[PDB]
Design a binder for this molecule. Sequence first.
Ligand code: HEM
Ligand code: HEM
Ligand SMILES: CNCCCc1cc(F)cc(CCc2cc(C)cc(N)n2)c1
Ligand SMILES: CNCCCc1cc(F)cc(CCc2cc(C)cc(N)n2)c1
Ligand SMILES: C[C@H](O)[C@H](O)[C@H]1CNc2nc(N)[nH]c(=O)c2N1
Ligand SMILES: C[C@H](O)[C@H](O)[C@H]1CNc2nc(N)[nH]c(=O)c2N1
Ligand SMILES: [Zn+2]
Lengths: 411, 407
Amino acid sequence: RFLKVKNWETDVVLTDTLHLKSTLETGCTEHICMGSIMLPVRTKDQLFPLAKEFLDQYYSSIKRFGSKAHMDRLEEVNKEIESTSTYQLKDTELIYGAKHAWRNASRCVGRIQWSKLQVFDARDCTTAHGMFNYICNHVKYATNKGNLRSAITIFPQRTDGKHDFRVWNSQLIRYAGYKQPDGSTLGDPANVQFTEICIQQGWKAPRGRFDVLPLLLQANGNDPELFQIPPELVLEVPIRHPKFDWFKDLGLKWYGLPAVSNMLLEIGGLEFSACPFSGWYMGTEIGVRDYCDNSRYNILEEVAKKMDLDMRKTSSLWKDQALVEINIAVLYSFQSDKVTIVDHHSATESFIKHMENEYRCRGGCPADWVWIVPPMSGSITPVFHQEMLNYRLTPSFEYQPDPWNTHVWKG
Amino acid sequence: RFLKVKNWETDVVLTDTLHLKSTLETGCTEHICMGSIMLPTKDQLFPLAKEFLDQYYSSIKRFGSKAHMDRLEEVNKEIESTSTYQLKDTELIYGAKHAWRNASRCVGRIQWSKLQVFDARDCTTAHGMFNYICNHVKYATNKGNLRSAITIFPQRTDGKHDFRVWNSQLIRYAGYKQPDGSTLGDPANVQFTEICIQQGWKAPRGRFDVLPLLLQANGNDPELFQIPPELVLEVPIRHPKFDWFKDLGLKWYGLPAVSNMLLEIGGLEFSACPFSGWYMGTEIGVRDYCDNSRYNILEEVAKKMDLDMRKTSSLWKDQALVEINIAVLYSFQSDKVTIVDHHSATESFIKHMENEYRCRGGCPADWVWIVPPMSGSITPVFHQEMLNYRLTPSFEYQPDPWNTHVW
Ligand code: HEM
Ligand code: HEM
Ligand SMILES: CNCCCc1cc(F)cc(CCc2cc(C)cc(N)n2)c1
Ligand SMILES: CNCCCc1cc(F)cc(CCc2cc(C)cc(N)n2)c1
Ligand SMILES: C[C@H](O)[C@H](O)[C@H]1CNc2nc(N)[nH]c(=O)c2N1
Ligand SMILES: C[C@H](O)[C@H](O)[C@H]1CNc2nc(N)[nH]c(=O)c2N1
Ligand SMILES: [Zn+2]
C-alpha cells in the first residue's frame, strides 16, 4: 500500500510505505479521528514475536540479516525467554533501540538529531541512591556548561511490575508550585500536586517563584526517596530583552536542560519504566507555553502593561504583540549566555528536511501535526503546510500512569 | 464508545455521545491517523431521506407523529415514482443550517441558527444564477454590517445537469504569471484566471482584479458575468501606528463567500450553494497576506519596520506578522465592516462547543483547522481536545468543474 502526503506550500508530494510496519493503535477509527486527544507483566507468548521483530530490524540495520550471528542471537533470546520469562539486550541493541524510539517519536520536532544520542546504560543500578548518582552524571554530561548534548539514562527494565524503577518527577528539572490559602499560586502551577508530594516526603520548601524541585526516585519497586540535585549542576538563564531594559525586572529565569523523566521506553517487548532523556529547548516551549499559558506562569498581562499596549480590547492584538517580545527575550537570553536553544523557524525548517530525508531513505516519517506545529506563528513555519501521517512504530516512548496513583506503599 | 474530551487549561471534561450518529468516513484507521490531510439510486436514497426526516421531525417535537409518518410515506412514494424527491422549504432551511452546524472545520458555528437561506431552486439559466448571486452579495454585505447567507440552486438530477459556480469563492482576486517569472496578483488563482480569459474575460492585469463569475446551469456550458463593482465592498489596509503601511497598496474584500462546495441534505445533492459569513482577521492577515504561495508580504513589511532580518531568531517574521494582523482588524473596524479577531472567535467557539455538548451531546471539530494560524496556544481552542467525525446534512468538497466538464 502507498500513501501520499502533500505540502500545500510547495506542492511536493511524498509517498509513505513505512506505515506498513505500524503496530500499536492510534485511537482513531473510520468513524472518528482522535488526532487532538492528548492521552491514549507480559506473557512469553507475546514476548518472542516482539523480540524477533526487533532483532530482525536491528540485524537489517547492520546489514547482517539472516547471518549466523542473527540466527544465533534469535536462538539465544528464545532460550532466555522460555527459561527466564524475559531477556537482556546487548549494549549495541540497547543503543540502537533508544535511538530508534527517538527516531519514531511522532510528537518530536527535533528528530533530525536522532542519530546523535549519548546512551547511559544504568541497568546495573540497584538503589535510589544509585539512581541519584546516575542522574547527576547525566545532568552534568548533557549540560556541558551550556553546550547541550542529547542523552538518555536507562535503568533496569520491568520484571513483574511490582519492582519498577521510576523517576517520580515528570521532568528532571522543574520549578515548585505552591497553592496559597487565598487560592493564588506561587511558582509553577503545573507542579502543585507534585510539590505537595515532595513536601509530604520531607522536602523543606523555600517557597519562592523558581525553586528547583528535588528528585523523588524509586528503585526496584521500593518507596521513593528524596534527593536534591547539586545546585551547581543546574544551569539557569535569567531572562532579559535586547531592547526593553525593564524586562529583567520581571524576575524571570528558566533552566537550560529539558529532560523528560516520566515516559516508558519499549524495545523488543521489554519495558524501561525509568529512562530519563534530554535534548535542548525550542524557544517557544518556554516563551509561549511555560510563560504564557493561563495555567502556567501566565505573564502576558504584566508584559503588555509594561509595553503600554492597548489592553481594552482583544482586537488590538496586545497578547500577540507581548507574546512575540517574550519569545524574543528567551532566545536572546539563552544565546547571550551561550546555552543551546533553537528558534521555531530553524527547528521546523530542519524538521522538514529531516522528514523528506526519512521518506527517501526509510519510506516515511510518522508525525503528529498537532504537536509538531509550534504554539505561535503556526502558518509562517513550513510544518503548518505539510500533510503528515501519524502512526506508531517500535521501539517507542510511551506514556505511563503517574507513580503516586499506582504505587503500593511499603511504609 | 462513549467518549470524553478534556480541556487542558480548565480541566473541564465533556462527554460526547453524538459521534455514534456519524455515517461518513474519516480517512483514519486504527493504524494510521490522517487528521492533517486536507482532502481525505432509489435504494441508496430512501434511508438517507428517512434518516434526515427523522431528525427533522424529532427537532420539531413531532417524532412518531402522523405528520411525520405521512411525510415519510409521501417522500417514499415520490422516490419510487420519480427516483428523487423535493424538500419542503422548512426542510431545506433546517438542512442548510444543520450543514453549517455540522461543519467540523468551521470556528464560527455559534452563529449557525442565524442563517438567511435563499431558495434558488426555481433558477433555470446562468443569467438567473447571476441575478440571485448579486442579491445574495448585496444582502450579505448590508453596507458592511454583514449577515450570514446561503443561496441554494437546483439539486443534482442525473449528474449531467449540475448547477455549478466555477469560482471557488464568490469574490476573489485574479492571478497572472508574469514574463519575468514572477506572479502578479493572487498566485492561488492563476489557473482559474486563465480559464476566465479562455472563456473571453478581458483581464485588466492588475494586482487586485475582482474575478468575474463563471456560472453553469443545468449541466450547460458555463457563462461569464461581472459582479456589479458597486456591490463588491473592499477595505484599504492601513495601520494605526505605521503611517507608511498604506503605501503598500494593500486592500481586501469584506465578504468571505465559499462557492465550490456541495450541500448534502437527506441524500439530495446541491452542487451550487454559495454561502457567506464574515471574516476572522487571521484569514486575511496571516494566510492571504503572509503565506509564501500567496501575497507573501512579510519581507516588504519587515523592511519598512527596519527589523534585523539577518537571522530567524530575531523573530522578525513574527513581529511583522502581528503588525499586519493589527492593520487588518483596524482597517475593517474603521470602515465599519464586520470582522472578528481570533481571540473573540475562538472564545465564542468554546462557548458554542459547551452549548452543543450540553444540548446535543457533542460538537464535531477539526482541531487542525479550528486553531488559528498565529498565536495558537494563547487561544482557548488550542487546549481543547476535539473529536472529529462526519454528520449529515453536510458541506462536502467536490471535483473542480473544469476537470469534470464535457464541453
Ligand atoms: C535535541 C533537541 C530536541 C528538541 C529541539 C526537541 C523538541 C521537542 C519539542 C518542542 C517537543 C514538544 C514538547 C512539548 O510540547 O511538551 C518534543 C517532544 C518529544 N520529544 Fe523531542 N526534542 C529534542 C530532543 C529529544 C530527545 C533526545 C528525545 C529522546 C531521546 C526526544 C523525544 C521526544 C518525545 C518522546 C516527545 C513527545 C513528548 C510527550 O509526548 O510529552 N526529544 N521534542
Ligand atoms: C459568520 C461568521 C463565520 C466565521 C467567523 C467563520 C469562520 C471560518 C473560518 C476561519 C474557517 C476556516 C477557513 C479557512 O481557513 O480557509 C471556516 C471554514 C468553514 N466554514 Fe465557517 N465562518 C463563518 C460562517 C460560515 C457559514 C455561514 C457557513 C455555511 C453556511 C460556514 C461554513 C464553513 C465550512 C463548510 C468551512 C470549511 C471550509 C473548507 O473546508 O474549505 N461558515 N469558517
Ligand atoms: C503536556 N506536557 C506537560 C509537560 C511539558 C514539559 C515540561 C517540562 F518541564 C519540560 C518539557 C520538555 C519537553 C522536551 C524534551 C526534550 C528531550 C527536548 C525538548 N526540547 N523538549 C516538557
Ligand atoms: C484551502 N482553502 C483555500 C481557500 C481559502 C479561502 C479563500 C477565500 F477567498 C475565502 C475563503 C472563505 C473561508 C470562510 C468562509 C466563510 C463562510 C466565513 C469565513 N470567515 N471564512 C477561504
Ligand atoms: C488538546 C491538544 O491536543 C493539546 O492542547 C496539545 C496541542 N498541541 C500540543 N503541542 C505540543 N508540542 N505540546 C502540547 O502540550 C500540545 N498540547
Ligand atoms: C497540511 C494542513 O492540513 C493544512 O496546511 C491545513 C492546516 N490547517 C488549516 N486550517 C485552516 N483553518 N485553514 C487551512 O487552510 C488549513 N490548512
Ligand atoms: Zn485520526
